[PDB]
Every structure is written in C-alpha cells, then in structure tokens.
C-alpha cells in the first residue's frame, strides 16, 4: 500500500476528540476573513427567511398579540373579522358597522392561512389500517413518496430533463444529471442500469455540442448502479466486471467532452471506489482529459487523507481532477451500521458541527491546489457558502471552482449567487444535481432527502426555524467546537446520545 493510501486506512475510525483536535486550526478562518464570512452569511440567511418578508410580518403580528394582548388562537379570529370588515365595498358602511352593531355579536373561511401566520386522526387510522390492511399501507407509502418526491426530480426521462435546462443554464448554471437508480440486485439490473447511462451520456453530450465540461452539463453515476450486490462485492470481481463498464462509460463521455463524475455512497465502499479510479485514471484514452469526476464526503474522518491521496493521484495522472465536496447523504445509516458491527468506533462523525469543521478543512485543502484539483463545493448551508466564497481568495475565476446544489433545495440561496453582480448576485457558477426517472427509481433518495430535510441538524430545517435567530443559524463551527470544549473538558467528544458501538 502506498504512503498517502496506507494514512487513509489507519484513520478510517481515528477516536473523535483526536480526528477533530487536528482538523481544528487547518479549518480556522483568519480574524479578517471570519468576519467577512460572517456578514455575507447573515445577509445569505436573511434574504433567505425573509423573502417575502417572513420575518418583518411576523414581527407585525407579535407588535399586535401584544398590544391588545390576546392569545394566538383569539387572535387569529380577530384577522378573519377584519379581512371581513375589508370586503364592504364602501367605507361609509364598513365604518358604521363598526361604530354601531360591532359591540352585540356576530366567516372564519381563511383562518387556516391566517393561522400559518400565527387529534382523533388516530381513530380514523386505526379504523382504516385494520380494515384495508398491509395494501392499503403500501400504497399509502408508495403515494406519499412519489408526492414528496416531485419537487426532487427534473423528469422521468433524460430527454425531458434535458429540455428544462436552458431556462438556468442561460442564468449561468450548470447541470449534473443522475440517472436515479441505486444497488443492483441481479446482472439484469446492472445491465439496464448501464444501458441507462450510456443512452444518458449520448443525449447530455450532445446537448452539449462542445461546451465541455466546465460549462456543459455533465452526468454523476454510482457504481453500486452497475455491479450487482455491489455492497458485499469481492475486489477481483469487481475490477473484472464493474471496471470495464466505469471505464466504457468515462470513454464515451470523453468522445463528447462532458464531466463523468463518481458519486460517493457507503462508507464500506470508499476503499473500492478509490481503487476503480486509480486505474481509470491511467487510461491511454483519457490521457490529457479532466473530466473525470470523483465525490469526497466530509463527515468522513479519512477526507483529509483522501484529498492527499486525490493530489498525488492528479499528479502522477497528470491531470486536473473534479472533486465533488459534500458533507455526506448516508449519516443515519452509517451509524446504525456500525453500532451493528461493534467495531472500535464510527467511520464517520458524531456531532453535526464536526462535520462542519472538516469540510470548511477540506475545502483549504482543495483550493490550495488549483492545478491539481476543480473543487465543486456542494451546500445549502449559507455559512458553508460564504466562508467557501472567502476561502477562495480575491481574484475569482471561472474555473477556480463551483458551487453545487440539489434540485428542489437549493433554489432561492443560489438564487443570489450566480448571476450579475449588477443585479446583486455574487457572481460564482453553480452546478444544479438533477435526478431523472420515474417513481420505480425514487425510493432510496427521496428517503435521505428526508433525511436531510426533516434534521433538526440540517442548514436548510433551522433556517425555516424563525424562533432560532439569524446569528446562531450561521454561526462559525470552529468557534462552535471550541465552546464545546470549554464547556465539557475537552475538544471533539462525541455526541452524548451517540456512545461507541462497544457500550
Ligand atoms: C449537488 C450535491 C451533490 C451531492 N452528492 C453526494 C454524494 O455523491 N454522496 C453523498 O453521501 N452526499 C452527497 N451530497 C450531500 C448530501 O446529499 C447533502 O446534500 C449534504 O450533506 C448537505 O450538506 P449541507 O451543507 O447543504 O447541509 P448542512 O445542513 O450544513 O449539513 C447537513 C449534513 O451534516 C451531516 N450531519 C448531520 N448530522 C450529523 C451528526 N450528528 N454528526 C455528524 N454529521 C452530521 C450530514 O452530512 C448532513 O447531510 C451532495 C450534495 C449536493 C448539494
């Protein structure tokens, strides 16, 4: 095993307190540039919850449940009359209502979104379930996915996504399609999964028509989509089944110059990925070709390890890699999975701020290296942009690195990011991850979209949290973890509710 190899495999389940001690001063923002970070990202997540004036109208309703001071449920019934009172055509008669026949008695049609301002359910439950039984629950389950889903999901084919692209890609972003599919059980699967790529790289390529792969759309892929059982699968039967197709599928999207990028899953199959992108990048083929794309996930402890190996691999390749930054989609599964094992400690991260830390690390890492490496930084989290936006340095250029976001999530923070800074926008590209296929494909990734959504950990649930004020929203992680530490003896304990899998 070679030397930045054999370090990613010694950190693989490094104790919390020492993973996090060292990641804290590499993650450290500059007095000057902490400041910075922190003005653009209070104004980020102030556009951002008070679009629409979310916030200034709410205050106006809390200045009146005070000041007459009524109760929440006496106080929306009071709007109901009052947008009542409002629908007298002429004041003549509105005003004498009140003066006259407004103190005797007395409609709530709109209380329902005056209260949005502002049970038994369980017997019809009960009823139903034992009446209708388990099809009736599997179709609840099945109805309800596909409803939640539509707001995740560009189109159920390639050619239909493809046509909603132009809308945003003449604001100045960029796409990234992923076929949805995930885990192949039989050949057959992988087979169709792979003949769904490569019907997807010939219609995103030819979209492309040229536009390479920085400013041209580009496809993500996951390997667990082209070998089947690849969650158990051996190394020799991967290199001689999966390899080929990885490498058949990177050829073609070569031919039409378009990023190929390998989207990270579990954390058991880091080691495996890390070896199919070894040798593909070795290929005569692609020789002198960057757009071979490879997903890193920070709440990981060996990240860092793997950027050093990711940097040596550019070198000796001799090419510019696409590293996709994440946090990671898979956190809730990792943790019960190894407290299943009962193995020395978590492959991943215990408190959401520590994953915070080490990607504001990792992203220094990336963009210290801007010959080696094109870091694509993906986030919804409004600190996590504006200290990326910092961290970058005076002198932006185009292709010193991306945003990315998700379909359906990162619209409105985006929203003032790419564009003209005539119109008030920060002016950095952004690469939109558009899933595409049918209800049979969306299972697995509507759930970690719930997963992520429904957090009360996640960036994009507080900010919805009014009641939590816009500085602890975006506050600095390392200054985070280090009140953490003054609190409770030390830096980097794990989360109190998540022991070590061996207690
Ligand atoms: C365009 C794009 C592509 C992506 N591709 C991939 C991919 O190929 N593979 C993959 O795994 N992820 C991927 N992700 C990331 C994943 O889907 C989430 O979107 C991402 O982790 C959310 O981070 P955020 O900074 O927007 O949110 P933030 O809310 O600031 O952070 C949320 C994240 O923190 C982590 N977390 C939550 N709780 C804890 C805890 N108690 N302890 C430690 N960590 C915690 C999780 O990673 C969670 O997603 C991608 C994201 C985007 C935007």
């Known amino acids: 095993q070679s030397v930045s190899r054999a370090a990613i495999t010694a950190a693989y389940r490094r104790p919390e307190t020492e993973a996090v001690s060292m990641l804290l001063e590499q993650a450290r923002l500059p007095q000057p540039v902490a400041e910075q970070a922190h003005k653009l990202a209070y104004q980020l997540a102030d556009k951002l919850r008070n679009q629409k004036n979310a916030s200034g109208r709410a205050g106006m309703v809390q200045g009146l449940l005070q000041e007459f001071s009524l109760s929440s449920q006496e106080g929306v ?26 103190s005797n008695g007395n409609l ?107 400013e041209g759309p580009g496809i993500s892929i996951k390997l667990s989509a082209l070998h089947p059982r690849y969650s158990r699968a051996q190394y020799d039967r991967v290199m001689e089944e999966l390899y080929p197709r990885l490498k058949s599928l990177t050829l ?9 990028n390998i989207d990270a899953e579990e954390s058991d199959r880091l080691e495996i990925s890390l070896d199919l992108l070894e040798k593909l990048c070795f290929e005569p083929e692609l020789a002198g070709w960057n757009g071979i794309g490879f997903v890193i996930q920070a709440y990981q402890k060996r990240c860092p390890l793997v950027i050093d190996y990711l940097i040596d691999l550019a070198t000796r390749s001799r090419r510019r890699l696409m590293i996709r ?20 400690g978590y492959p991943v991260y215990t408190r959401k701020v520590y994953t915070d830390v080490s990607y504001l690390a990792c992203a220094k890492k990336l963009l210290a290296v801007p010959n080696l490496i094109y870091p694509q930084f993906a986030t919804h989290n409004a600190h996590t942009l504006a200290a990326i936006y910092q961290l970058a340095g005076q002198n932006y250029y185009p292709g010193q690195y991306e945003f990315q976001c998700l379909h359906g999530m990162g619209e409105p923070l985006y929203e003032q990011v790419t564009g003209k800074v005539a119109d008030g926008k920060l002016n950095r590209p952004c690469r939109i991850y558009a899933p595409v296929g049918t209800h049979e494909t969306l299972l697995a990734y509507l759930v970690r979209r719930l997963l992520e959504n429904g957090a009360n950990t996640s960036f994009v649930n507080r900010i919805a949290d009014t009641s939590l004020p816009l500085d602890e929203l975006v506050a600095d992680p390392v200054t985070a973890v280090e009140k953490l530490a003054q609190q409770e003896g030390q830096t980097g304990l794990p989360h109190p509710k998540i022991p070590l899998p061996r207690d």
């Not at 109901?80 to 006259?100: G, M, N, S, V, W």
């Not at 059980?185 to 792969?213: E, F, P, W």
């Open 252 to 260: 073609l999207a070569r031919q039409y110059d378009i990023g190929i």
């Open 77 to 102: 019934a009071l709007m109901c009359l009052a947008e009542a009172l409002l629908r007298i055509p002429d004041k003549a008669t509105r005003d004498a209502l009140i003066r006259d026949k407004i």
């Open 325 to 344: 930054l994440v946090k990671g989609a898979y956190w809730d599964s990792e943790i019960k999975r190894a407290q299943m094992d009962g193995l020395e």
């Open 108 to 214: 709530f049609v709109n209380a329902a979104t005056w209260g949005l301002l502002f049970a038994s359910l369980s017997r019809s439950l009960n009823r139903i379930i034992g009446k209708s039984g388990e099809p009736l629950i599997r179709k609840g389950v099945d109805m309800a996915m596909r409803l939640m889903g539509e707001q995740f999901v560009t189109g159920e084919t390639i050619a239909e996504a493809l046509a909603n692209a132009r809308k945003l890609e003449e604001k100045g972003f960029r796409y990234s399609y992923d076929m949805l599919g995930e885990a192949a059980l039989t050949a057959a699967d992988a087979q169709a999964y792979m003949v769904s790529y490569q019907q997807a790289i010939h219609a995103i390529g030819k979209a492309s028509n040229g536009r390479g792969i920085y």
